[PDB]
């Protein structure tokens, strides 16, 4: 019961199942295409603080995947490495054949800890995590992915690092990592470009920790 789009010299139509269109010729299987599109193209927020609120954990439901033949370049991809407070892993290792998404502009790598209630992390809106040419219902550990959806039809990076605490819950906190001992408090009003600009002025000017302590920066509210 999965719909197919049909591309005409008019517009994009959705193929029926009850109505047979005699002129909708299919000459080969090469005219059928699976396309992975990103959610960012619909205006969903992409900052880390808001993104992680769309994900959550559950048990009793197995993971599954489907393939793509083509897809979009992502401006914002994510890569998670989350551990439980006791040091154990939250996310499963990716299985053979799963590789990261090939075309990301900024990768938001989040490392940290938090409660992990289930077996797997699932998307709450039912969107898929997009891996190289495979969409998945779950997040795999250490693998870069984009969020998105898959269409079927008839045809005729800069790496930004963050630390996280309380990753799997509602009230969580994040830091932007400049150096091993240098961090900036993260806010939802920051864009990837903003963070890169802060990394250049702080690092270049030497406003970094010299002692063994952690230097934590807070952006002026204005």
């Amino acid at each position, epitope marked *: 019961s999965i719909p197919l789009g049909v591309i005409h010299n008019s517009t994009l139509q959705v193929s029926d199942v009850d109505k047979l269109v005699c002129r909708d010729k299919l000459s080969s299987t090469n005219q059928l295409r699976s396309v992975g599109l990103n959610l960012e193209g619909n205006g969903v927020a992409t900052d880390v603080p808001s993104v992680t609120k769309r994900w959550g954990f559950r048990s009793g439901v197995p993971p599954k995947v489907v393939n793509y033949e083509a897809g979009e370049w992502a401006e914002n991809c994510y890569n998670l490495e989350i551990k439980k*407070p006791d040091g154990s892993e939250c996310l499963p290792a990716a299985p053979d054949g799963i590789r990261g998404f090939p075309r990301c502009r900024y990768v938001h790598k989040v490392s940290g*800890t938090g409660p992990c209630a289930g077996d797997f992390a699932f998307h709450k809106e039912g969107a898929f995590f997009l891996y190289d040419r495979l969409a998945s219902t779950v997040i795999y550990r250490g693998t870069t992915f984009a969020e998105g959806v898959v269409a079927f039809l008839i045809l005729p990076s800069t790496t930004i690092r963050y*630390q996280a*605490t*309380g990753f799997g819950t509602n009230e969580t*906190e994040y*830091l932007f990592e400049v150096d091993n001992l240098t*961090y*900036v*408090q993260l806010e939802s009003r920051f864009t990837p470009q903003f963070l890169l600009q*802060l990394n250049e*002025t*702080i690092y270049a*000017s030497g*406003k970094r*920790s010299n*002692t*063994t*302590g*952690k*230097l*934590i*920066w*807070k*952006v*002026n509210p204005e």
Partner: antibody, heavy 136, light 107 residues
Framework: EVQLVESGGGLVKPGGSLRLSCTGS???????????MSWVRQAPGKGPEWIGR??????????DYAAPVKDRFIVSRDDSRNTLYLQMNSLKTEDTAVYYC????????????????????????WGKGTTVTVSS | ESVLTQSPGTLSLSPGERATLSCRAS???????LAWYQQKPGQAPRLLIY???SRATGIPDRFSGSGSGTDFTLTISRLEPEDFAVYYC?????????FGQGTKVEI
């Protein structure tokens, strides 16, 4: 700029227990983006003794204890209330001491960008010390 | 464990004279993990020096630490009347913390 002040002391009988507290201000909150906090005690006539310290949540939130208090004292924090606590069980009269809270903090360099603080693995800020007396 | 022992137990020097106090650790330790503290009755100890050789702020230049391995020293180039305090060593050990026993400095 950081200050922390101890309370919850006074006279307790041996074989009992008590919980000390230390509430501060001048920092950026003591739970996240902050130094962990320790307890140190000093009996009159004696030097300081490390009890243990609670790490910040960004550093895991665990407690590292000194051997002399293992399995008797617990170091914990009231998150976002900027308050450090010490639960001392199985009290003996040997535990009479002044109990101090201590913090690896203080303000760092500023920039046109924003403000900053440093969180250390040593102590810059000491509280006043609350005397705990354990006696019959 | 890694334990700090101070020597001499008491230092005796007129103000204006140089003073040194050493600590010997039972275990070798890197410089970045050492500190000394200054205590007077009624006060919590002041930091003075940390990281073996890095001065704490609010501390005069006459106070300077040095050392490596198991042997560390605090040197006061000229000991002033206001500096005749009890001094302690401290080490971080990358996890457990240790304090020295307390050494008295007298005129």
């Amino acid at each position: 700029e950081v200050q922390l002040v101890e309370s919850g002391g006074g006279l307790v009988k041996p074989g009992g227990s008590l919980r000390l507290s230390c509430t501060g201000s001048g920092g950026t909150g003591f739970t996240f983006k902050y130094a962990g906090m320790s307890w140190v005690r000093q009996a009159p006539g004696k030097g300081p003794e490390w009890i243990g310290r609670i790490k910040s949540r960004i550093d895991g939130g665990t407690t590292d204890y000194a051997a002399p208090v293992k399995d008797r004292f617990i170091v914990s924090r009231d998150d976002s209330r900027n308050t450090l606590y010490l639960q001392m069980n199985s009290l003996k009269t040997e535990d009479t001491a002044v109990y101090y809270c201590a913090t690896g903090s203080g303000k760092g360099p500023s920039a046109s960008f924003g403000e900053s603080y440093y969180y250390y693995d040593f102590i810059n800020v000491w509280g006043k010390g609350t005397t705990v007396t354990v006696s019959s | 464990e890694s334990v700090l022992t101070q020597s001499p137990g008491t230092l005796s020097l007129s103000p204006g004279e140089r003073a040194t106090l050493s600590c010997r650790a039972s275990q070798s330790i890197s410089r970045k993990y050492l500190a000394w503290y200054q205590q007077k009755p009624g006060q919590a100890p002041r930091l003075l020096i940390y990281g073996s050789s890095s001065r704490a702020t609010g501390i005069p230049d006459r106070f300077s630490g040095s050392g490596s391995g198991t042997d560390f020293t605090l040197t006061i180039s000229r000991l002033e009347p206001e500096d005749f305090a009890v001094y302690y060593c401290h080490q971080y050990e990358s996890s457990p913390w240790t304090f020295g026993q307390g050494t008295k400095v007298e005129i």
